[PDB]
Amino acid sequence: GIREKIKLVSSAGTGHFYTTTKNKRTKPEKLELKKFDPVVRQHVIYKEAKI
Amino acid sequence: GSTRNGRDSEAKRLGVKRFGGESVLAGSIIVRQRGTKFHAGANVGCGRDHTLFAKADGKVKFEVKGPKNRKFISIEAE
Amino acid sequence: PAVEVRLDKWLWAARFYKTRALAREMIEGGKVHYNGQRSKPSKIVELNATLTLRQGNDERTVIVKAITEQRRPASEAALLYEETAESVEKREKMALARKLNA
RNA sequence: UGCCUGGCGGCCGUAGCGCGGUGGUCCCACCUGACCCCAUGCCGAACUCAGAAGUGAAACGCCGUAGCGCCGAUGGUAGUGUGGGGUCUCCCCAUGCGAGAGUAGGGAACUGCCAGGCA
RNA sequence: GUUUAUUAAAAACACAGCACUGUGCAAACACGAAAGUGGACGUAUACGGUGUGACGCCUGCCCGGUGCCGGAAGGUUAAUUGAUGGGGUUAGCGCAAGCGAAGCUCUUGAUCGAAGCCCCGGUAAACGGCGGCCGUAAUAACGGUCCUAAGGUAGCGAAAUUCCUUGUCGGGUAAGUUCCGACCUGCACGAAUGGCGUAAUGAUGGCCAGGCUGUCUCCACCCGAGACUCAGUGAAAUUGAACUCGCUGUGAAGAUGCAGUGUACCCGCGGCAAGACGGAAAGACCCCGUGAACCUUUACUAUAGCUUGACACUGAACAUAUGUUCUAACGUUGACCCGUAAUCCGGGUUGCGGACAGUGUCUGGUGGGUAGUUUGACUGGGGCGGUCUCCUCCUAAAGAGUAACGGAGGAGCACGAAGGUUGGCUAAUCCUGGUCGGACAUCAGGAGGUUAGUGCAAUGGCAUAAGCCAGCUUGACUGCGAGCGUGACGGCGCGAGCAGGUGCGAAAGCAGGUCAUAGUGAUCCGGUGGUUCUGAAUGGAAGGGCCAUCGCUCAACGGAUAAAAGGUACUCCGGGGAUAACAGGCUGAUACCGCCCAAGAGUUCAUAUCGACGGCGGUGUUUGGCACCUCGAUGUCGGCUCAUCACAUCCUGGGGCUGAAGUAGGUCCCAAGGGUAUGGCUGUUCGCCAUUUAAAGUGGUACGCGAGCUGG
RNA sequence: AGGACCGAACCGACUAAUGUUGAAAAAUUAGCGGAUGACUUGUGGCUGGGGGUGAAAGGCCAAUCAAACCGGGAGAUAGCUGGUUCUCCCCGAAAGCUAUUUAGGUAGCGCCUCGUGAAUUCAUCUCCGGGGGUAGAGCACUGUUUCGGCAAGGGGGUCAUCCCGACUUACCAACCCGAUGCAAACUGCGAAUACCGGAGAAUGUUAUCACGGGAGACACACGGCGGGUGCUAACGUCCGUC
RNA sequence: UUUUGUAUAAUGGGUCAGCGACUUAUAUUCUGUAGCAAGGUUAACCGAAUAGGGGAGCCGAAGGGAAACCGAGUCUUAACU
RNA sequence: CCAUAGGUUAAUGAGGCGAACCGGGGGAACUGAAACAUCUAAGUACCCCGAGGAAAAGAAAUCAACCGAGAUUCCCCCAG
RNA sequence: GCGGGGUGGAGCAGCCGGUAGCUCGUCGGGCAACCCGAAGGUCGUCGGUUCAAAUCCGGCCCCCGCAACCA
Lengths: 51, 78, 102
Description:
The structure is cut from a larger assembly and holds chains A, B and C.
Chain A: E1 4-10, E2 17-22, E3 32-36, E4 43-49
Antiparallel strand pairs in A: 1-2, 1-4, 3-4
Chain B: E1 15-16, E2 23-24, E3 29-32, E4 38-40, E5 44-46, E6 52-54, E7 58-65, E8 70-77
Parallel strand pairs in B: 4-8
Antiparallel strand pairs in B: 1-3, 2-7, 3-6, 5-6, 7-8
Chain C: H1 7-14, H2 20-28, E1 33-34, E2 37-38, E3 51-55, E4 58-62, H3 74-80, H4 85-101
Antiparallel strand pairs in C: 1-2, 3-4
Chain B binds six RNA strands through strand 1, strand 2, strand 3, strand 6 and strand 7.
C-alpha cells in the first residue's frame, strides 16, 4: 500500500543488506538499527537506503 | 436474482491431533486450536498460533486443574 | 482528469451576470469578447488566458489560473478572477470617462 | 504431644458471598519518622528504608448461624445405537445406553512440608 | 421499365430531374508488380464518386464528436549525424595492491530532423444531433432553472411510424378491432439516409356499392378422364422378426406385444384415414464444440494503397541552410527526319520542363481497401444480472472433511512502535456526594466482577493477562533443525534444540515479529549489489551460475498470448432430449369447485340469499415448478368437416326451503335421454355489438381432429 | 411524333386449379403484363473465383454460389457420433476430492487389477485412556416473548407551593424481582453414536501398509436415516452415512 | 449402442453372400525367458559369407554439488552434536 | 559525311517429349501449441528455369588447441 | 426484476463517522448592474452499529435510466 519497501545497508562496508517497509509520509526520518551481519559476523549499525 | 452471500473460507483442519493416552514423539503437535482452549502444562509448549506440542517423548494426558477449571495437556514421561 | 469549463459557466461563477441565461444572451449579442474579439458561448476559458469581458459599461481583462465550476461568494470571486494591474487601470479609466459623461 | 500464627502447596465454590461473635505473650496487620537506599506521569496512597509509643478499630484468621451461591440422589421423562412396524411432515415395539431441569437431601471444607509463641 | 432462373414482381432496384464533391488532361478514377488500356481519339456546357428520385411549395437551428478543407506562433516526434559520460583490453608505472596513454570495442545518446498528433479557424444537400426538471392559465400558454454544440421552424400526425389501443367524436352497416374524416395526450414524424401535396399510370395495399352468379343456406342431376371388372406389360418409398384386438392399470412416465379383464370362426375385395409417437430429410428452432464460414467496427496484430523526410540516380555557378540563374543527368502520352509499306519501338535534330518530377533502400503518419484471429467459465436451458482468490460463523449430523445462484459479515492492510524484555497497574455499568457541569466530562466512595478492552469482520482465546502505563532496547538476528500437522502436487504451517552474536533482567529466564486465524501471485523474461563458481586457444571480459533483492487488480486470482470487440433470419458442420420452446409425465403453490366455525348484512332472525377474520379438502382446468420421453424430427394458433366422453346442468324432466300470494324468480338436491344460433369487426379462440331461441353449458379427448381440408 | 392506346407472332411470369414416387429436377389448363422499344432474337467475341457481371435480389457465373468445378497438400483436424468380429477361468470398480478458457476432456489422489516385500499390519467384540458441545434440555449469556409486583423517571398538568410529601391519568413506564415460551449463526448443562489410542481371546485364504507394471472412472438413480433450498410439493435440486 | 434407467413409442439393421477396423518403423521403461556376468554388447563397414573381423561407441560398476572441486563421501554454513 | 542501326543470302547450333533423381528462381495453408499472432507444419505440397546419366560440392582466407588433422560427398556414433 | 437519487421555497458542492454550507428566491442595509447582513434544511420515513449518522447497514414509499429476449 502506502508503505514503500526499503533496504537497510550494512555500515560494515560489506554490501550486505536487509529489506523492510515503511511509509514516508508519517516518518520522514531515516531508519537506523543494529542488525546482525553474517559476512562480518558482528552486530553492526544499518542505515536505510533506496531500493 | 442476485445474492450477496456465497462466500466462505477453507476449513483449517483444527482439533485434537493426538488424544489422551497416545504415545507421541518429541515435538509432535497435540492440539491445533484458535486461542488457548487447552493450556500448556508439564513438558508441553505453546506455539505462537496456540498449538500445543510435546517437548518430550511420553504419553499425552488431559486434565482439569486450577481455580479456573481449565484443561491442561501434559506428557507423562515414559 | 481536468474538468472542462464553459465560458458562460465561468462568467456565472464569477458573478458578473445574475444568471447563466443572461451570460449566454450577452455573449451571443457580441458584447462579450474573448481575447478582444467576438466569441461563442461554447468557447473554453483557459488559465493565463485573457477574458476581454464587457459588463455594463466597463471592460475587464483577467488571465486567472483558478477556474471554478461552482459559484462562490463575492469574497471568493475576487480571487476567482485575477484582474491584472493593466485591467485595473483600464477599468478606472473607463470609470473616469463615465463620470465625465455623467 | 495439644492449641494458635506465618509462609509454600495439594484441591478448585460441600471449599465462595452475607449476618453475629472472638484474638494481641509470640506472629500478622494497622501505626511513628523519612534528610538519606527507593518512588510518585502529584501525594511516603503504592513501593522503599529507619523503628516499636498505641491498638485488634479496618483488614486477616478462628467459631457459630441457611438469607444466597454451590453439590445432589432414587423414580419418571427427553434423546438415541441395532432390528421390526404404523394411520409415515411424526410415532411405536424389543433390546442397550440414558440425560437436562425438578424433588427429598448435603453443606458454613479437608489435607501435606517447614518455621515460630504458649501448655 | 428491372429484379430473388426454381415459394418474395413489390412500397424494392433503376429512371429523367436536383445538389455536393473530385478532376486542367500524362486529368481524377479503374484493370494492371510494369509496360500499357478504359476514361476518350472526350477537355469543366466533359468525366468520376455520393445522396435524393418527375412536377408544385420549401429544405429551419447546431461545426462540440468523427470526417474533409485551410494555418503556423508553440510542444511532442522516426530514419540519419554521433558531442559527453561509463565500461572492457593493455605498451607502460609501481614491490604488491592498484593506476593507466594510443588503437580496437560494448553501452547511454547532446545537437539536426518532415508529416502527423496536441492546437486555431471553415464546412451539415458531409457522417450526425435537435435534451432534462419545476411552477404557472384540470391541461400547462408562459416563465424559472441544469446541461449541451443547439434543443424540432414550415409542414404533417394513432400514419408503412401510436405500446396503453378496438385512443375520442362522426359516416357507412341492424351490428364496422378494418376503411374514410377531424382532434393532438407525436411511448418513439420531420424537411435531399428529403417534408407535404399531386393529374396520370400500377398483374401494388385497404375499404365500399351496382351487376353477377353453386362461394354459401344445400346441395341435385347430367356429360367426359381415372377409380371398379377382364386380357397383356409391370414400378416405388418402407421393411429387426411377427401367430399384427378393445379397455383399465403398469412401465424409460402416451403399450398389438407387460398384469387383470372383455370380445373375437379362417381369408379376400371396394372405401375412410384415428393409431402403428406412420414414410421422407444423423432438427433448420435451443444449447454444447476452447468447430467453420462470410460480414461489421474507434477489438488485436499485420499489410496493399495514399502520404512525410534521409541517402542514391543528382550537376554547375552567383547572392544571402535559403533564393536567382544555367545545362550536361532525367522526363516529354510536343514538332520534324529515318529504319518504314508503321499513331508501337528505337536513333537523330529541335523545342519545353530540368536537377524538380519520377524510381530503389530506410523511415514516421494514415490505412476494415485486404488478411489471420479473439470475443472466458458457473448458470435448475441460454441471454441479461451476480460470482470467480483469501479470512470468520452457521447449514456441518458432539474427531477431520463436506455442496447449493444457501444464510450473514470482512480482506488486497497497519506498526521501528502498535515488536523484545523488565517493572508496575486493572475494566463496563450503576448509585451517592461535589462550582460552572446539565442524562453522559473529570474528583471521592460504594455496588459489580470483565457485562470492558483487543489497530481493523467474526469465532476461539486472554487476570500469570494476549488488556493499560513506563525504562532500556532491535530477537521484525545469521546458519541449521529432532518431530509433527495439512494438502493430489506445487506448497502452506507449528517447532523444542545446536552454533555465532546481541537486547532486557540482579538472577531463574524470554526474545527468530505483532492474541491466533485474512492483508496474496507460480514459472518465464529481465533489472540492481555481492561472490572468479564457470569463462568455447591462452590471459581478461561479455554472458551464464550461487546468494540477497526488484517489475503483474497475470482480481477469469494454479496465472493460454507481450498483444484481441461484435453480427448472421444468407448460413454451415459434429453432437445432445446430458439442455430450452409445443405436447405428454410428476407436484398442486396459484387457478377453479366444494366444505367447516359463525361476526354481520337481511326492519326483529347467522344460516331464504350473501358471508368478513381464519380453517379443511377435491379436480388436474389456467398461471407456474422439475427437466423424466421424444432434437439420426412428436407440425404450432385459429377456421372447415367429423365427432366421442365427464357432469361441477344452459334448456327440457322430478323435488325440498324461500324474505315462495299467482306469473316470474333465488338457492339446493336427483338426472347426461335428446337438444344446445345466424351475423358485423378482427387471423382470431376470447371479446364488444345486432337479431334470435326453450337453450345458445363448463371441461377432457397431443390446449380432439393438417398420411382429413386450408394457411389468415 | 409518342419509352402513346387495344390486340396476335414474340418476350415475360400476376392469380387459381392439376401435378408433387409429375407428361416435366419449376411444367399443363383458364385467366394475365409488354408488344416501335430501357424491345426481342440468330451467329461469333471479351470479362475467371476473393475474381467476373450485377436497372442491386447476395442475384447469376453449365440443374451447384455469403466465394464455382476439377486435381493436389490430404489419411487436414474432429476433447464429437457410430462400430470394433472366436472361447473359457480368477478378480472386480467409479460416477468422489483437488486444479483446469474447466464443467460431456484431461492430470494427481481416492476406488480396481497383477507382482514383490513386510510387521499381530487390519476388522468385529470386551475392558481401559481420551476430547467434544450435536439430539435433548435450559434461559446465567446473546436475542426474542407473555403476564404480574415495586418503581427509578417521564408524559396531560398540578396540590404542595423554591421544594419535599405525592396527587388521578390519555398515561408511557427503564432496571430489578416472581411465573411461561422460543433459537442454525444463544449455552452456566449434556447424551446415544462416531472417531483416536492401548491391552486381551476367537475368527478371517494378509482381510493392512509400502514399491512397481496395467487400467477404468471423475453424467449417477432410488430407498432408509440427519439436513439446506422448495410449498417439511415433485420420480425436483445440493450435501452426510448406509 | 447410449444411458441412472429402454419391451420401450430412443438409435442401427429388409435378407443372403463377400470385404471391413488396435497394425508397421524406430527409441525408452517394466515383466517373463535365454546368453554372458563387474562386465555386457556391437552399429556402419570388410566379408561370397545368417560365420569371422571390427569394441568406434552405449549402459552400469560412485555419489555429492550450479560449478570449480571433493570422493565412500559430498553439499549446506565460519563450523556443525 | 565517315560510321552505326537496318535489309538479303549462306554455314553451325537450338526449339519438342519423357517416370523418378539433381541444381537453382518463387513458395502456401490445413495442422501442433489442447484457443492464437512469435513459432511449428516447412523451405514440405505446388509453379517455373537448366542439365546429366548422374547432378551438386570439391582442393582450407577449414578445423583444432600450444599436441595435431590435411579437398568433397555418403554411412555408423558423438546425441536427442 | 437490476442499479442511481431522495439535502433551506428552487438548483447545488459537499457530507461520505466528528457540531450543516454556497447561488438564486424573500427582507433590510450599502449601492439597473454590483456589495454586505439576516430568517430559511433538520438531511424521503422507520430501525440497527458507533462515544457520535447529513455520513454506515437492514426494511419501507416515490421518481429516474435499463432488461423482461430466442423459440
